[PDB]
Design a protein around this ligand. Structure first.
Ligand code: ATP
Ligand code: ATP
Ligand code: ATP
Ligand code: K
Ligand code: K
Ligand code: K
Ligand code: MG
Ligand code: MG
Ligand code: MG
Lengths: 524, 524, 524
């Protein structure tokens, strides 16, 4: 359609107006004194959130050029959320500061390309300095502090996340879901607990618990789906001769085979329980093989070549305990080779490295957590759905921040790491004066998060920033107590990954934004 | 529908207004000091680009006659992008200059047809002079300089493209795709690496790598799809007698045949791996034949006449190494006749010459790069998607410019080649004074790119153009450093093909545009 | 009424837009190649003029802030017209250039007050350098060149003005009026020619000429008005005894006195002619006293004390010749003391110095021109009234420029004097960097007149300015011939007063304009 074209100061001014609208909606959420933003939803009640990414996602302006700027600067928060899951508001603040200072420089007549190059050089040096300044975060105390800070100072959330990570270990998985109660609950399950229940309610050995409990049972892992008892009769006869119980993991057991297994279950010749194999095509086989590796068994398939009529007790797997319920199947202490379990885990790790999809890699990591480590569910407790959504967002931010901290370490919070980095980079220079000015605007924007935190607390951002800069190391300003001190000692920690990601994405977007001279959009 | 008709100076003025709108949106991107244009997208975030073709494609005006002019002059950028992949902004600037001067001449009362004829004669002479002035660009240093200049002075992009061309050779292929990391990555694969993985995960000889590795295996190339082991049993028996591994390239191996091959793979009688043939109908056969030529084998087909029961070891191909993964199959050092490989490559070259489709010719060239030469992928590294798009556009422009340079050579950049060409053509004359004036306006427009570069740098275009014209040879003006010198020595090079294509397309469109006396469009 | 208030870049941008509208309407008139502007008049036909002051006076914009800027920058042209009567377009161009560069500096973040101070310092130094570079313009050839240049190269106007000044001398007066013919006419009258005709038509001594001609007559200067012959009878009797004619200069002669004088005129006893005294109250007495000083007589008044009955021949003045017509009275070679005439002229000069009104000082200068020197009228010849107005404006500009040249000298035209002044002031510095930048913008704007002249001629302003700056002394660019040479030799001269006044007024207005941060106006 017909296009409105704007040039020079007019287009840049409208772009900055939109960026400022979005960043002003977002930055009110920054800091422990940060406020909440209510986002109207066309469906359901409004969402009250302290997430800059959510606020930015909702922002959209009538003016096409202002909306253009808002959309461009919203990529910063979106990318920060995608990568680190935290620091979206900080990244938006950094992008707004960089855009403002760079547009000042552009109106000053400096080359926008050189300003962008200087910003990029300053940000690269700042990332290197952040890596140097970062310290490993392996202690549960530091992890709890990081989670508490990322959850808007919810010590309960921080300590719960620390406990969950301690329980599940390095290779473990943690997920966040809704809770029925008012309190946050942690549910940790070890080993395999794939979500497949008994195929027949009459397999229940223990009625008062409504669950099948097998002690030292064999495990028969069948890739095919079975409807007749003939193909398995040798296996059931061998199991009955052995005397121990049996668990079948199959695509489907139904009809004559299922009925015969059930009848034998009452008759007591064999304590047999059957369940569906977990997952679906091209993943069911993988999970069956992981169970085989855990239990020291082999998967019976037609592709592999073996037949069920020829299956033997040695072919069958072994585990110490098994608990089936209507919902989930759990195998406890599968009798399998530890070297083999680690080899399979390494293969799944290689698959995760090869993977390029978030869903694929998280499913692979869930498989790793089932094989080794454990799986934890944090049920967020809230009285209402709006509170549930807000607390779930905060808990997810805390979990993401803790993962970032373990992955890349921690730095002083409250915008102190960026302040120190800029102080170290004061001597940095570019190829020309425009690049030097770009470096300087990047360094000055590095102070934007702390200044915005102070502003939201209501104090004087310039005074606080000057005091922090005069300080050294981890010395900083506590927004909660409105005092100064060592941020590490006070427990105000930010993941180095979060800070670096915010800086990087904000710098890229803001540099390209300031390099703009024309804006083309649809007419009103 | 009812039509608005405009005549003479009014129609030409509206046409020029639209052309000027488009060219003003586009030309701000010209030069190292050129700025970026933000294009609103109805879907997704706005696109920040320095590409005149993209800007022109987005341009569209409310006024029907202005939009008419914009659309006509947009063909210049579109055709330049299609042919050379670079110089779109230069072509648009040239078209705008030619249109402006020619419309001045038309208002001056000269014959527009004679002006167009003079412009065409001047452009033909200018193309001949560009060919004379061009120098071959075979050195990796010149290639890197060309890529760096076309990538808005990204030495990293230039050197990466130079390395990729050095690795893949003349007949090699290079493509540009998105990258997950922040840095630009180069991935070069030699020989055949068609994207077909193992048909059965259990073929993996090396589990820690999750890949099949065959040393000196035979290759059985089957055009048909196979589901039974009977037709192949003689071949498998011969292979087992030989003792070396075997790779099957077929339309599909499934069911009994696949299962038997897999079972034999564990049993160790024959180290057999099977994969799908690459491509689809009417291309699968061609790629199978190229693999046969590479490996010194023969393709088994029903059309050709041979049967698989009668296939022999001599019929089977031979290669030194083979590596299969879930994603791709790679054959290393196929034992085939070099004369035959060159003959097949020449046949594919003849097919490329006969081809009239970009997709067909690029697929044929990919086949050539698989047979001989190699295939390179440049994964563009960017922190955000907008930066990724901008950097990918710049890298594609650099790759296109480097290909143009190798194809047709290089000339002095910064609008210096056109300046020198016009100086050489100062004595050119037409059949009449109107043709002479058309020649003169074409020559004056030849200076438009340099003047626009200077204007974007903020200096005085007339002074810079006068100094460059007073200079001789490759003497020019460095927009980046705002100094004068030998453009070749400074590394400011433009492909002769890019310059010639921009000039030619701009001249054709602009001449026809100035020859206009009436414009017919839909009413508002 | 309610007010719209605008701040910062928005207000300055609107101010600059209005200034640019006015300056663009005005600057098309600059140069020998300068064009004419047609100004619609609510009454009468439109006025075609090449006067920047007239164009600016007519300019008025719909937007209140743009109109604000236009009105402020119109003061420059108005003040230049009031002071020098020429250089209005040059002053407007200088103001526009200063405003543009200073607003660039302001957007650059420099202090507007310091920019204004630097501009003022640069302009003071430039005025001093203009005074140093100026050369006296006392030769009629230089005067004619100046007039020709100021009349848009009308050699006829220049030579006519040179002849008029040569005739009337230094203390003479020149005025411009409409002419009935197609050719410009010069009418010079020496001595006293006050516009008072014979009180009675029958005084005509020469009927074929319809005028009174008296040879060596006495002059009776009466401050009172007379209606009876008794008070004068002794004087008439003495005159009749003497035998020479008599001229009465009185407030009014009527009734019995006039009738008796007329009757005696026929009877021939006394050749008496009577006329009204010139001017009105508080000026009639002064002009009567100047006539008395010229003719060596005394004014008869009641305030002074003498009575007409006691007046004598010695009291009566003496002159060599007298010519009265219905329109004007002229006295030729009044017999008065030269020392006295110079003393009265010096007294009138002191009165001119004390005077603070243009009308008062021009009337005093007319009295000086009547006493000594002469009075010249240039009747502008034109075929139509529009041509008459245009040519009269050009002739008035030429006269003002010639007066400025005699008063303060001449400098090289075509914007060369300002170029040389800026070159000399290149080393000038202020108290701070903002003042230095203000100096630099003033120096760059000093080049604006030459660049605008070149632009109106259609050539390259930057190239022409560079060539002129590379030149030295009076070397410049001839807009008429589009060649370079010594402007003095080519006859392209501009009054130093005109150039200095344009620079000063433009600098003052532009500095104050750039020092603006808020604009308050009425709402739309
Ligand atoms: N008590 C505190 N004193 C000082 N700074 C604090 C304190 N608590 C938190 N902060 C800082 O507040 C900053 C912003 O945290 P917040 O969770 O509000 O937003 P964010 O990290 O920018 O992003 P998101 O909106 O995605 O959660 C963090 O950098 C943290 O360092
Ligand atoms: N440092 C430099 N000095 C002088 N000229 C330069 C310099 N760098 C690039 N140029 C010139 O800039 C001109 C424009 O390059 P640019 O990549 O901006 O646009 P283009 O080639 O017209 O088209 P496209 O928009 O499709 O990339 C090229 O002709 C190149 O010669
Ligand atoms: N032949 C010429 N070559 C170069 N410059 C010339 C020539 N003739 C005139 N000029 C310059 O043209 C400039 C502008 O003259 P012009 O009479 O058009 O306007 P002005 O002096 O700015 O003001 P005004 O509009 O009040 O007359 C003068 O400075 C004069 O020096
Ligand atoms: K927040
Ligand atoms: K471009
Ligand atoms: K003028
Ligand atoms: Mg947070
Ligand atoms: Mg390019
Ligand atoms: Mg003039």
């Amino acid at each position: 359609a017909a296009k409105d074209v704007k040039f020079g100061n007019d287009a840049r001014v409208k772009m900055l107006r939109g960026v400022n609208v979005l960043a002003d909606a977002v930055k009110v959420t920054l800091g422990p004194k940060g406020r909440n933003v209510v986002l109207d939803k066309s469906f359901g009640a409004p969402t009250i959130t302290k997430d800059g990414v959510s606020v930015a996602r909702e922002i959209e302006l009538e003016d096409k050029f202002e909306n253009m700027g808002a959309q461009m600067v919203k990529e910063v928060a979106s990318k920060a959320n995608d990568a680190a899951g935290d620091g979206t508001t900080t990244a938006t603040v950094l992008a707004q500061a960089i855009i403002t200072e760079g547009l000042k420089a552009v109106a000053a007549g400096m080359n926008p390309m050189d300003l962008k190059r200087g910003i990029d050089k300053a940000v690269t040096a700042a990332v290197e300095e952040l890596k140097a300044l970062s310290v490993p975060c392996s202690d549960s105390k530091a992890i709890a502090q990081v989670g508490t800070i990322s959850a808007n100072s919810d010590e309960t959330v921080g300590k719960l996340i620390a406990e969950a990570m301690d329980k599940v270990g390095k290779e473990g998985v943690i997920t966040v879901e809704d809770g029925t109660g008012l309190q946050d609950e942690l549910d940790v399950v070890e080993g395999m607990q794939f979500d497949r229940g008994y195929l027949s309610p009459y397999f229940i050995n223990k009625p008062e618990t409504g669950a099948v409990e097998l002690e030292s049972p064999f495990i028969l892992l069948a890739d095919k789906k079975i409807s007749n008892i003939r193909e398995m009769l040798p296996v059931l006869e061998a199991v009955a001769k052995a005397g121990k119980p049996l668990l079948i993991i199959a695509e489907d057991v139904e009809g004559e085979a299922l009925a015969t297994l059930v009848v034998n279950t009452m008759r007591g010749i064999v304590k047999v329980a059957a369940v569906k194999a977990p997952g679906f095509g091209d993943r069911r086989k993988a999970m069956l093989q992981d169970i085989a590796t855990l239990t020291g068994g082999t998967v019976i398939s037609e592709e592999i070549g073996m037949e069920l009529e020829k299956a033997t007790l040695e072919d069958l797997g072994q585990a110490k305990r098994v608990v089936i319920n209507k919902d989930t199947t759990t195998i406890i202490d599968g009798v399998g080779e530890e070297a083999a379990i680690q080899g399979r885990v390494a293969q799944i790790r290689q698959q995760i490295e090869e993977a390029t999809s978030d869903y694929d890699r998280e499913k692979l990591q869930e498989r790793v957590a089932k094989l080794a480590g454990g799986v934890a569910v944090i049920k967020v407790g809230a009285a209402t759905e709006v509170e549930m959504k807000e607390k779930k967002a905060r808990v997810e931010d805390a979990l993401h921040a803790t993962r970032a901290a373990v992955e890349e370490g921690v730095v002083a919070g409250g915008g102190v790491a960026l302040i120190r980095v800029a102080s170290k980079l004061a001597d940095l220079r570019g190829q020309n004066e425009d690049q030097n000015v770009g470096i300087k605007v990047a360094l000055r924007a590095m102070e934007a998060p702390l200044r915005q935190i102070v502003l939201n607390c209501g104090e004087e951002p310039s005074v606080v920033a000057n005091t922090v800069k005069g300080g050294d190391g981890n010395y900083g300003y506590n927004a909660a107590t409105e005092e100064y001190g060592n941020m590490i000692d006070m427990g105000i920690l930010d993941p180095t990954k979060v800070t670096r990601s915010a800086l990087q994405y904000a710098a890229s977007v803001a540099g390209l934004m300031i390099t703009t001279e024309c804006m083309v959009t649809d007419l009103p």
